[PDB]
């Protein structure tokens, strides 16, 4: 009735703060893993050059 409730009450703030920090850490890790991917595709100039070779020009 008295002791355990008082100690739980004393615990509450630190746990709340630590859990808030943990959530912010999760969000930060989520953000840090985002990178914009740039893909390289075969230049069409080579395709045009090959077309010329097929044209036998």
């Amino acid at each position: 009735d008295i002791m355990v409730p008082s100690f739980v009450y004393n615990k509450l703030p630190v746990i709340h703060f630590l859990q808030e920090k943990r959530a912010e850490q999760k969000l930060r890790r989520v953000l840090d893993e985002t990178y914009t991917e740039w893909t390289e595709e075969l230049d069409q100039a080579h395709v045009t050059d090959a077309i010329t070779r097929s044209l036998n020009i």
Partner: protein, 77 residues
């Protein structure tokens, strides 16, 4: 021989019931050393070294309800 008597804490028991039906933080403890046995970090004990906390707190509460209030005249320990 069996003697039937009562402790002198009935009013204090009533006050405890009245004032502690709701939770309240405790920050001042007469014997605080029972909660901090290890002062150097990375030291840990496999023995149940925190088993004495509950008994310590209850004993402090009981002995304080008796001794401190015994200063009031006619109060009985």
């Amino acid at each position: 021989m069996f003697l039937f008597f009562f402790c002198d804490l009935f009013w204090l028991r009533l006050l405890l019931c009245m004032y502690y039906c709701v939770w309240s933080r405790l920050c001042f403890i007469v014997y605080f050393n029972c909660l901090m046995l290890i002062f150097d970090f990375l030291l840990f004990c496999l023995f149940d070294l925190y088993l004495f906390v509950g008994l310590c707190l209850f004993l402090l509460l009981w002995f304080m309800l008796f001794n401190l209030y015994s200063l009031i005249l006619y109060y009985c320990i």
